[PDB]
């Protein structure tokens, strides 16, 4: 049946605005209450507001009244969510969702209930930082690794913006034992993470280990050979 | 906007409680039963009541997907809306609009289409609206069929009503009971948001019923079906939305070709008709006659007797 | 606004065991029509939220029978009769009675297992990074359970505070363990001034804390 497909990721400066779309595909949702829900990195889910497209009746949570407007096509139910005067705290994934039953029938409470069709989400990053590819430094394995059967090595992927970054090892051939940690936002406004892998100690002198970092937002691919 | 009623003869109009034409006018005493139909309920200014909706082809029809009850020829229909949207039980109505409003065994045909190839199928089916399995307000209706195998799951299934049946081994005409409302929630709780019961509250007056004969499919069923308003009157009042200048509209049944008035009646604002008569009587009328709104009258208007 | 309160916020579950999640509202969610306007949602890792229960106790289409919702008024419960691995994620309750719709904090369901000690590794800053004028020291805690771990940095036996950031992976699907990085950030000058860089790890799977260290150079 119908699917909700949202627009791609966004990176905005504070004080700017963003308009995220939620296209109805394989059907129409115009007679349903369509809610917009967001998830900040540290928080859970928060209902921002909604629209019933065929009525053009909106409802907005107090937190967002005056800075969010939701519009929608009367026939398809495709909707837009525009959030203005953006701040750092608006950095979040934004979802559109449809109630399970429509809000119109032929013949203090808004819409219905049971949001059962959800968009895939839209990441909105709000920051004063500028785009920057990461610097990739080696996390060299201990020279003392042979006394152990297992050695750990990795790569420090430092000072990039925005998310996300992709890290593979040996061009994707090495997947077992790889841990690519969630990035941490530094005080500088840039992201940083480490990617590590555990390998047999006896493979250090024989096998080559290269971390492949792809930062698609900046069109930056950088490799780093990790040497003992 | 002046109030009016359609210029349509009885035979040109449709019963509002079953998808069949009107046949005749009947009056009789209604003190021995509760007169509370939910279909064919509409105020003279166009407010639909009970389970009343606008088209008569939707009365007593069901839509949804069916689940076989294993070890039987019975299926549970998980109701969809008329739109094939999911069912919503939170609407301020007694049941989906057009749900049957009498207890009886309604026989019809269950049809189904397989979405992927367009293959179709149809089987005789009966719904027993007096059973606890009849819970359309909760979104489920049970059908007894001729098959235990042919209906597929998760495919659009529709019930088309045809008529009513009766177990001929019991007292003939003991069912259906047109004045016994179903339990829309399968006997779990009270019916809700009902159109009120109606009763003549003027001495010597009785309800005037717009009567049809339901098709009988088996046995010896009571096939009389009385509605309080023709469906065309419901459709007309909804479209016109003419304000009621009093509680009581005075109607005259008129032969348009001789101008002769055969009787007068009261069309009550809440949507039912009374006549001055005592006893059961099939009205003998010229088939070309129609109802004509003449004036708004007060509560103490005495009707000319209906001979 | 109606305040929705979930309990517990963290729920490690054993596959095969039942699980129960509580949700309380600041006022009654029972409508005059007899329905409780309470939904349950599940957000599996890396996915959009999905509907589990609507109107208090109605299972959504396709939801397996092991999920059930009950309760009334201000007290509600989501029950999983038998937890399966695919049930991990964050569960949310949500009232739909009044606008704005409000969620509970969320209950994060993860897999319970016996304690597994972290294997600790320490990495000095690379020579490449040192040229750019900053130094990051990386301590790795690999494949441990439970998630709770205490990581203290010592530099020449002086306990560090406020100059390190932690990051932890999501639970591994095969061994149900976590991994954790603790990164000590120093100026190149502060780094070269000192000699002993130590990472002390305290964890319930360790009989005694584990320290990994290196001497600069």
Author numbering:
A (entry chain E): 1 to 107, 115 to 235
B (entry chain A): 225 to 531
C (entry chain F): 1 to 217
Wording from the paper:
Noroviruses, comprising a genus within the Caliciviridae family, are non-enveloped single-stranded positive-sense RNA viruses. The norovirus genome is organized into 3 open reading frames with the first encoding non-structural proteins, the second encoding the major structural protein (VP1), and the third encoding the minor structural protein (VP2). The HBGA blocking assay and a virus neutralization assay using human intestinal enteroids reveal that the GII-specific mAb NORO-320, mediates HBGA blocking and neutralization of multiple GII genotypes. The Fab form of NORO-320 neutralizes GII.4 infection more potently than the mAb, however, does not block HBGA binding.
According to the structure, NORO-320 Fab binds perpendicular to the 2-fold axis of the P-domain dimer near a region close to the shell domain and significantly distant from the HBGA-binding site to inhibit GII. P-domain in complex with NORO-320 and in complex with HBGA revealed that the P-domain dimer structure remains invariant, with an r.m.s.d. of ~1.1 Å for the matching Cα atoms. These structural observations indicate that the Fab form of NORO-320 cannot affect glycan binding either directly or allosterically. The Fab binding site on the P-domain is formed by residues from the P1 subdomain of one subunit and the P2′ subdomain of its dimeric partner. The paratope in NORO-320 includes residues from the CDRs of both light and heavy chains. The Fab binding is stabilized by both hydrogen bond and hydrophobic interactions. For instance, the sidechain of N479 in the P1 subdomain hydrogen bonds with I54 from CDRH2 and E74 of a non-CDR loop, whereas residues L486, V508, P510, P511, and N512 are involved in hydrophobic interactions with residues from CDRH2 and CDRH3. Residue D312 of the P2′ subdomain interacts with K119 and Y120 of CDRH3, involving both direct hydrogen bond and hydrophobic interactions. In addition to CDRHs, three light chain residues Y35 and Y37 of CDRL1 and L55 of CDRL2 form hydrophobic interactions with P313′ and T314′ of the P1′ subdomain. In comparison to this GII.4-specific antibody, NORO-320 recognizes a highly conserved epitope that allows it to recognize not only GII.4 variants, but additional GII genotypes, and it mediates HBGA blocking for GII.6. The binding of NORO-320 Fab possibly could play a role in impeding such rotation and elevation between conformations, resulting in lower infection efficiency, although we did not demonstrate this effect directly.
